[PDB]
């Protein structure tokens, strides 16, 4: 059955709750972003109102064939009324189209649901600054102090310099980037830009990218793999066997692959600096695991919550084990005592 942390009290609303059948007494289903653990259950047969961003609405219409009449896109940073309740969508700094949702309950309670987010100080200057939040439904994916990672900017710098050096030393090297969902587009777009290439990809992936309102996208992407030296492949194919195979398919146009796997976190972060990352190499194939995250680090998440000062926190991630739940609760208490709320 639908867990309590997907229900918004004092409303008929649920968040990211599409895999439970008909939720009893739900009058509107909100979708924070187009990732499969969150949309799981939607299709052309869904007949209840879905509230989301424009971008997420483009993906629902074109990738899952949800019918237009049940898609209710909302503009960002705008007070809107949904079944008699004021709501605002804010940018979550996650993947394209991902939002946080502010609910203003008729009784005066104010609820923020972060969906998935990467907290940023820029959030401290949105419509969040304007009123108090009583309950926070928090993306706790990396809510433990071992999770440190670099900025997105530092990671992209590393990738661009790496790719540019390699191809300039060997103009017959191919660059490959892995993907399994939307998000992380900067990785492959930034590399293609420095190399003067388009990114080549499957028709299905090109279709997905065309739903995202990215400026000048027709100029950065293509389905002609032959004309491209940056190729996008499914994440599963980013291994020595899948890459050797791919290289065969290029018909002696290339003699070396440099591949990138943008992971969330990996334990080399506790020790290693971004400056100090090295690939795994086999023959003429090298694979770089880079820590490009679209979720908050522990320190980013802590700063956000200590700024917001919510009266109650409801975690939405890592809730399935008692040891996880109890450890998170302990962090929340520390943060509250250190900050004085
Ligand atoms: Ni996500």
Please report the DSSP string for 219-263 in residue order. HHEES-GGG-SEEEEEGGG-SHHHHHHHHHHTTTS-SEEEEEEE-
CA distance to 16, 29, 41, 55, 73, per residue, from 50 (Å): 10, 5, 12, 13, 8
Contact 71, 2 (CB under 8 A): no
Q: Which two tokens stand for residue 142?
A: 């990396």
CA of residue 167 to ligand 1 center, whole Å: 33
CA of residue 267 to ligand 1 center, whole Å: 21
Contact 5, 14 (CB under 8 A): no
CA of residue 116 to ligand 1 center, whole Å: 5
CA of residue 94 to ligand 1 center, whole Å: 7
CA of residue 107 to ligand 1 center, whole Å: 31
Task: List all residues 6 or more positions away from 215 whose beta carbon is below 8 Å from its beta carbon.
Answer: none
CA of residue 35 to ligand 1 center, whole Å: 5
Q: Residue 146, CB half-sphere, CA atoms under 13 Å: how many?
A: 7
By what technique were these coordinates determined? X-ray
* Resolution of the structure, angstroms: 1.7
Contact 64, 39 (CB under 8 A): yes
CA distance to 2, 3, 226, per residue, from 24 (Å): 10, 12, 52
For the domain 1-147+296-341, what is the CATH superfamily, name and number? Ribonuclease Z/Hydroxyacylglutathione hydrolase-like (3.60.15.10)
Q: Which two tokens stand for residue 213?
A: 């309102």
How many C-beta neighbours within 10 Å does residue 73 have? 17
Residues with CB under 5 A from ligand 1 (ion): 35, 116
Where are the CATH 3.60.15.10 domain residues in the chain? 1-147+296-341
CA of residue 244 to ligand 1 center, whole Å: 31
Please report the DSSP string for 258-269 in residue order. EEEEE-S--THH
Output DSSP code: residue 187: H
Task: List all residues 6 or more positions away from 193 whose beta carbon is below 8 Å from its beta carbon.
Answer: 220
Q: Which two tokens stand for residue 160?
A: 């661009």
Where are the CATH 3.40.50.12650 domain residues in the chain? 148-295
Q: Give φ, ψ of 45 to 5 degrees.
A: -95, 0
Q: Which two tokens stand for residue 187?
A: 């990785």
CA of residue 308 to ligand 1 center, whole Å: 22
Host H or E run for residue 319: none
Give which of 63, 116, 51, 123 is closest to 305, Cα–Cα: 123
- Exposure string of 27-39, with b = 16+ CB inside 10 Å and e = fewer, is ebbbbbbbbeebb
Strands 71-74 and 285-290: unpaired
CA of residue 38 to ligand 1 center, whole Å: 7
How many C-beta neighbours within 10 Å does residue 277 have? 18
Say whether 95 sits in a helix, a strand or coil: coil
Give which of 23, 73, 65 is closest to 48, Cα–Cα: 23
Contact 64, 41 (CB under 8 A): no
- 178: β partners: 233
CA of residue 282 to ligand 1 center, whole Å: 32
Output DSSP code: residue 243: H
Output DSSP code: residue 64: S
The correct answer on CATH 3.40.50.1970 for the domain covering 148-295 is no
């Amino acid at each position: 059955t639908c867990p309590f942390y997907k229900k918004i009290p004092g409303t008929g609303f649920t968040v990211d709750a599409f895999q439970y059948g008909v939720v009893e007494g739900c009058t509107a289903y909100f979708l924070t972003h187009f990732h499969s653990d969150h949309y799981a259950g939607l299709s052309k047969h869904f007949t209840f109102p879905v509230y989301c961003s424009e971008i997420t609405g483009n993906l629902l219409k074109n990738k899952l064939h949800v019918q237009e009449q049940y898609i209710h896109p909302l503009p960002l940073d705008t007070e809107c009324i949904v079944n008699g309740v004021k709501v605002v969508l804010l940018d979550a700094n996650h993947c394209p189209g991902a939002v946080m949702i502010l609910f203003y309950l008729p009784n005066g309670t104010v609820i923020l649901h972060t969906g998935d987010f990467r907290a940023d100080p820029s959030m401290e200057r949105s419509l969040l600054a304007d009123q108090k939040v009583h309950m926070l439904y928090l993306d706790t994916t990396y809510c433990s102090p071992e999770y440190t990672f670099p900025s997105q900017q530092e990671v992209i710098r590393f990738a661009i310099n790496t790719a540019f050096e390699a191809v300039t030393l060997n103009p017959h090297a191919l660059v490959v980037c892995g993907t399994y969902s939307i998000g992380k587009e900067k990785v492959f777009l930034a590399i293609a830009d420095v190399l003067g290439s388009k990114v080549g990809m499957s028709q299905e992936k090109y279709k997905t990218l065309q739903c995202l309102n990215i400026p000048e996208i027709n100029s950065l992407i293509t389905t002609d793999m032959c004309s491209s030296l940056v190729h996008l492949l499914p994440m599963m194919q980013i291994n020595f066997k899948g890459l050797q195979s791919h290289l065969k398919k290029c018909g002696g146009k290339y003699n070396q692959i440099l591949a990138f796997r943008p992971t969330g976190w990996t334990h080399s972060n506790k020790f290693t600096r971004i400056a100090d990352v090295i690939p795994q190499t086999k023959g003429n194939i090298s694979i770089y695991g880079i820590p490009y995250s679209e979720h908050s680090s522990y320190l980013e998440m802590k700063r956000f919550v200590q700024w917001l000062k919510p009266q109650k926190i409801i975690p939405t991630v890592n809730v399935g084990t008692w040891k996880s739940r109890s450890t998170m609760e302990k962090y929340f208490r520390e943060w509250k005592l250190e900050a004085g709320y």
